[PDB]
Amino acid sequence: DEAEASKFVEEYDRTSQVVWNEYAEANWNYNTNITTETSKILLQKNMQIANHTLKYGTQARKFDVNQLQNTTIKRIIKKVQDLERAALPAQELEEYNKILLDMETTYSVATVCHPNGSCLQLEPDLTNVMATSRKYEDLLWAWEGWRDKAGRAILQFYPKYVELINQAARLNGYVDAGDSWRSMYETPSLEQDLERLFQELQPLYLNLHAYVRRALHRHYGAQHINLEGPIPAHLLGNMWAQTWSNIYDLVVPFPSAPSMDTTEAMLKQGWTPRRMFKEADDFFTSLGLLPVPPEFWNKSMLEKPTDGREVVCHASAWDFYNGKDFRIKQCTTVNLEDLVVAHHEMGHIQYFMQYKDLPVALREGANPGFHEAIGDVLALSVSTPKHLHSLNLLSSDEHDINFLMKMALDKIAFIPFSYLVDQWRWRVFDGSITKENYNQEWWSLRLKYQGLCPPVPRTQGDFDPGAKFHIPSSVPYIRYFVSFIIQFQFHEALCQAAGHTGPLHKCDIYQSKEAGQRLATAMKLGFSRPWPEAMQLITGQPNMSASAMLSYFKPLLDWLRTENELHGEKLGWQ
Ligand SMILES: *[C@@H]1O[C@H](CO)[C@@H](O[C@@H]2O[C@H](CO)[C@@H](O[C@@H]3O[C@H](CO)[C@@H](O)[C@H](O)[C@@H]3O)[C@H](O)[C@H]2NC(C)=O)[C@H](O)[C@H]1NC(C)=O
Ligand SMILES: *[C@@H]1O[C@H](CO)[C@@H](O)[C@H](O)[C@H]1NC(C)=O
Ligand SMILES: C=C(C[SeH])C(=O)N1CCC[C@H]1C(=O)O
Ligand SMILES: [Cl-]
Ligand SMILES: [Cl-]
Ligand SMILES: [Zn+2]
């Protein structure tokens, strides 16, 4: 009966703690030291963790969730009925694990070598190149090189990963893996919800896109930039053209109101990775949110190790399910871009900390977008000129439009990219897209949503999606599209809670205890209630809505329209 359901839930949570704890360490030992031994150990703890998942998932399914009074118990047991990969037969489960690990190693150890010299790693050698070069051919070298090395080598692994994860999903009662992922939002209208949100941010993006294309035309020359066509994917200052802030100089609305070189200022002033995470820590405490435990500074990996040992460089935050041990792993570089990433990751840690008293089953984000948005909200305030000037990294209507542009190159530009990744991935999981149409359909979406074309035509053998961490790493990506919309909603709520008046882009919530209180009450819920309840606690209303973001950039939209009009731009790509 009911009494048996809660004994079960209590038994699940305590054994899950221990086992999830042993898994995370082994996972961490591999991530921060990629070698054969750590892999072998990670592969072994995988069987263990699966042995545990099966035992408890099998039991959970013997419960009729319908007969259960307590909703909290209802929801845990229902979640425990999802075995994930552990639904797989033992041989396929061991193959599946091997595939993932092989895909992750492949991605993380890949290099792009000059004919007779330097071999370059994605972080930060290729990343730096993408950000800083303005020579069409060097950009192309790195763009194509990364795709030829990480992309192509992921291709051999992907169709079978796809086969196995779909089988896992069908074995857990889903139609395919994407359906399973989407299910994490508990929102049957998810797809239409996101599509409507995407349509709302269009005038803003089409206008950004056209303005940026006009500037690229001006720097790279008419022969390379068609003013009525897609932008070559390699000129946006970022390996994936996902954020465009690194070409700010080429696009600056008013060079007449020049801005400081932040990276100069950071390096010159003895900024360090440690100091960047310490300032993020300080920002969270200014709000009366939790500080990171001493142990965090002992255990984290906040910069690229010097050992000559391979690591997964891509930033991640780690909950050890201890209530005590929390870590970040980042190959942090000293620039403004990674300052923002350090806040993003610190929002993860803060979320682990707020909900650490919940049962581990419910130790997760209200939805995955919420988990991604926390740190970004604070970073919206960090990124203000008034906050940046106080960090000694910066020094007036002109400056205001420059700021919004800077922010727009980061935030608006990512909207179609974050929409596209899982539009392609869902259509792969459900069979619309086969290993023969992988790359072509990836670029039909790059064109449709982002207005990009590949600068080099793609050939059979290319698997460009394999060149983005999340594909080989099998981490869903819609979470980030949801993150970008909602964080603006959170920022607007927190700003009004903090008493601030007038144009929303001028808000800085540093030290606002009222804002900290809203986020905290929301984060403590973990995954115990459906997300609209947290949405409500923060914003006073239950929906996702693009309105705050439209409102944040409204002055920029006006300026972009005027400006694209007078140059006679033709928005979009025919
Ligand atoms: C269904 O079962 C759950 C889980 O056993 C019940 O939720 C739990 O309810 C207790 C008592 O309301 C909560 O404790 C409270 O929270 C804090 C910290 O523990 C404390 O300071 C308060 O004074 C109070 O004791 C507990 O947090 C809560 N647990 C969870 C995971 O939500 C729930 O009440 C049951 N529902 C019904 C309708 O009986
Ligand atoms: C890398 O792995 C080896 C052997 O598996 C281990 O002894 C060593 O501690 C690891 N290196 C670092 C820096 O942790
Ligand atoms: C910060 C992370 C690691 Se959780 C990340 O991967 N981000 C942050 C936003 C989307 C994105 C990306 O790399 O593309
Ligand atoms: Cl690409
Ligand atoms: Cl997600
Ligand atoms: Zn994140």
Residue numbers in the entry: 40 to 434, 439 to 617
The authors write:
Human angiotensin I-converting enzyme (ACE; EC3.4.15.1) is a zinc metallopeptidase that plays a critical role in blood pressure regulation by catalysing the proteolysis of angiotensin I to the vasopressor angiotensin II. Because selenium compounds are known to exhibit better antioxidant behaviour than their sulfur analogues, we have recently reported the synthesis, characterization and antioxidant activity of a number of selenium analogues of the clinically used ACE inhibitor captopril. It was shown that selenium analogues of captopril (SeCap) not only inhibit ACE activity, but also can effectively scavenge peroxynitrite, a strong oxidant found in vivo. Here, we report for the first time, structural details on the binding of one of the potent SeCaps to tACE and AnCE, as elucidated by X-ray crystallography at 2.4 and 2.35 Å resolution, respectively. Captopril is one of the smallest ACE inhibitors and with both ACE and AnCE, key interactions of the selenium analogue's central carbonyl and proline carboxylate anchor the inhibitor in the cavernous S1′S2′-binding site of the enzyme.
